[PDB]
């Protein structure tokens, strides 16, 4: 039995967390949950930090499952704090078409891997003179090298054949040039993986026409996660897309890319697919492939029959019913 840190989070979070806990229990998965409800405090001086209780837990257990968390009302988000505390440098977002849920894109099997410490996150905005705003963004050699190494490592460990580096090196000659340079170095070591480079705007142009050509996409964080969101839109949206953040010292936190959904935060409505498939990613990362495959197949089979789907996928059924039917099928 293995201990993973559970951050239930806000809004629909507690509902969907409970749902995942139930599926794992029904599947007889060797997982026990250390609940940590994490809220921002002030420690040495006025500096914001996560509670020691939650940090001790994650540093020990290494594996985390996380519901959605709120943005603060007054101006330092919990997602930012978790990101900096554990040095979550690699965001992984697999996008696979779901056989039951039909979109105009049926052939999608894409993993986006995004640098998660710089670009948009290293930013400062400031006012130069009245009505003139400057933004300042950063890209480093070390972080570019680290994400490139990770992308090719992920490609091996997940039986992927192609890694495409995504850039705007026409505009961003120095920063994307540095990114491509470091991707090219790693590509020399890992000749068993096919490597190519593509313009971001060309990726987008083609993605929308034929997503089947794309395998693993690696990119810096200069544009945030817009490309990942495009890929998510191809397969049904935020309610079904899983995510993982891999960091320093073996730490990996898995989460849904969707928000707290405060409008539907009222009891029994939210789709737990996204968090569940993130928990599936977590199992695979832990080496628990047999439990991953079974839980995964149970979720897919429930969606394929389509008689108890949640309101966002077009069905009339509520969360607990959808959850109950996955628990039913996973026992077999």
């Amino acid at each position: 039995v293995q201990t993973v840190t559970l951050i239930p989070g806000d809004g629909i979070g507690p509902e969907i967390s409970a749902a995942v806990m139930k599926i794992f229990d029904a599947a007889k998965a060797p997982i026990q949950w250390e609940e940590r409800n994490v809220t921002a405090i002030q420690g040495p001086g006025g500096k914001w930090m996560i509670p020691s209780e939650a940090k001790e837990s994650m540093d020990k257990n290494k594996m985390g499952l996380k519901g959605p968390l709120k943005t603060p009302i007054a101006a330092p988000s919990m997602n930012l704090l978790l990101r900096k505390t554990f040095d979550l440098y690699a965001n992984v977002r697999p996008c696979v078409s779901i056989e039951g849920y039909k979109t105009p894109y049926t052939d999608v099997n894409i993993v986006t891997i995004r640098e998660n410490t710089e670009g948009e996150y290293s930013g400062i905005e400031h006012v130069i003179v009245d009505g003139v705003v400057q933004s300042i963004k950063l890209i480093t050699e070390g972080a570019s090298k680290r994400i490139a190494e990770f992308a090719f490592e992920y490609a091996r460990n997940n039986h992927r054949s192609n890694v495409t580096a995504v850039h705007k090196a026409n505009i961003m000659r120095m920063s994307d040039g540095l990114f491509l340079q470091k991707c090219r170095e790693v590509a020399e070591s890992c000749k068993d993986i096919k490597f190519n480079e593509m313009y971001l705007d060309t990726v987008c142009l083609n993605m929308v026409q034929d997503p089947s050509q794309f395998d693993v996409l690696v990119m810096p964080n200069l544009y945030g996660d817009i490309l990942s969101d495009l890929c998510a839109g191809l397969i049904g949206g935020l309610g079904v897309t899983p995510s993982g953040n891999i960091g320093a010292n073996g730490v990996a936190i898995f989460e849904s890319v969707h928000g707290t959904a405060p409008d539907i935060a009222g009891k029994d409505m939210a789709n737990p697919t996204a968090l569940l498939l993130s928990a599936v990613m977590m199992l695979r990362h832990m080496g628990l492939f047999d439990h991953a495959a079974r839980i995964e197949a149970a979720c897919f089979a429930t969606i394929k029959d389509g008689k108890s789907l949640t309101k966002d996928l077009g069905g009339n059924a509520k969360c607990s019913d959808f959850t109950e039917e996955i628990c039913r099928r996973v026992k077999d």
């Binding site: 894109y105 009505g131 003139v132 933004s135 963004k137 050699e141 120095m174 945030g224 817009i226 839109g233």
Partner: protein
């Protein structure tokens, strides 16, 4: 008779320009093309001469200039120098579903108005500490107001109903917030147009599921031209969509996307639609509306016949054969 600068460009550009000249001769268009070339040299003399030719003629039709993203950072993009020097602040693209070109989505009709002088084109990069590259971009009130001003004027004059500002003001609170507020200021003076806003992240997701909701989009020069390329892809790709670049005095016409089509060049297979529609928008800017309508109608009527389709949209026809059908529809009028 008007005199228009022509930049043939690289890849499929020169071959498509010849077909434009051919269509123009057959339609008796009172336009003469004065050619200037932009080569691959590190020297900036060629692009400066091109700028000079545009200042004199005020109007250009161009193919696309090859970008080499392996040349030193001193070598700036030639197309973007052209855009900044001539202050062509409004990039306008019309992504519209063609009945004869069947894609995954129907009834798309989107006008995209992108700021075209600031943002990413104002970017300054420096490596003042080894292994650390810092980038510095500008958004301003003056340039944001004139793009918003442009999009609303275009919306009202085209009989459009809705302008949606696409932004990331949730993250870039000051810059994109400033852009958003400039759109709001202009919106107050256009009470017949519905004003809406959408986060760029959510816009791309909406585009691949329900692109029918969008009417006119206005956006700053940010997020790597994702939206324009997604929309171009939705309606059938780079072979179809025309682009325009307007300043207060100058205008430059081209395909919506920058791809040169190097690998298909000189093989008589390039789709001529985008380039032909670009030349039509050019004719409208010149106030030669009758010629624009003749050629545009011919192009669209031709695209209705799938035997005329080129390989980029699943067809088997050649460029010259498509040009033949276009000329045929013109002569019938």
């Amino acid at each position: 008779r008007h005199t228009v600068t022509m930049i043939p460009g690289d890849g499929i550009g020169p071959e498509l320009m010849l077909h434009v000249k051919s269509v123009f001769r057959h339609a008796c268009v009172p336009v003469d093309f004065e050619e200037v070339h932009v080569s691959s040299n590190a020297d900036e003399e060629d692009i400066r001469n091109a700028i000079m030719a545009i200042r004199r003629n005020r109007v250009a039709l161009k193919g696309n200039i090859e970008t080499n993203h392996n040349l030193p950072p001193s070598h700036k993009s030639r197309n973007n120098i052209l855009r900044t020097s001539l202050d062509l602040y409004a990039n306008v693209i019309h992504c519209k579903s063609l009945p004869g070109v069947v894609t995954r989505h129907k009834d798309i009709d989107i006008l995209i108005v992108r700021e075209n002088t600031e943002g990413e084109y104002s970017s300054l990069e420096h490596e003042s500490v080894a292994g650390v590259v810092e980038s510095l971009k500008i958004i301003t009130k003056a340039k944001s107001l004139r793009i918003a001003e442009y999009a609303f004027k275009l919306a009202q004059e085209s009989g459009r109903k809705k302008v949606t500002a696409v932004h990331k003001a949730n993250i870039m609170k000051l810059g994109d917030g400033l852009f958003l507020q400039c759109c709001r200021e202009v919106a107050a003076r256009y009470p017949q147009i519905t004003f809406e806003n959408m986060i760029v992240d959510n816009t791309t997701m909406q585009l691949v599921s329900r692109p029918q909701q969008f009417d006119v989009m206005v956006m700053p020069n940010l997020y790597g031209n994702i939206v324009n390329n997604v929309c171009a892809g939705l309606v059938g790709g780079p072979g179809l969509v025309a682009g325009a670049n307007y300043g207060h005095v100058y205008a430059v016409f081209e395909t919506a996307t920058r791809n040169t089509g190097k690998s298909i060049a000189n093989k008589n297979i390039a789709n001529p639609t985008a380039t032909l529609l670009a030349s039509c928008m050019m004719l409208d800017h010149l106030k030669l509306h009758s010629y624009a309508t003749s050629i545009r109608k011919a192009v669209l009527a031709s695209m209705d016949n799938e035997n005329m389709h080129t390989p980029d949209i699943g067809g088997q026809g050649t460029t010259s054969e498509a040009i033949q059908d276009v000329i045929r529809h013109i002569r019938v009028i």
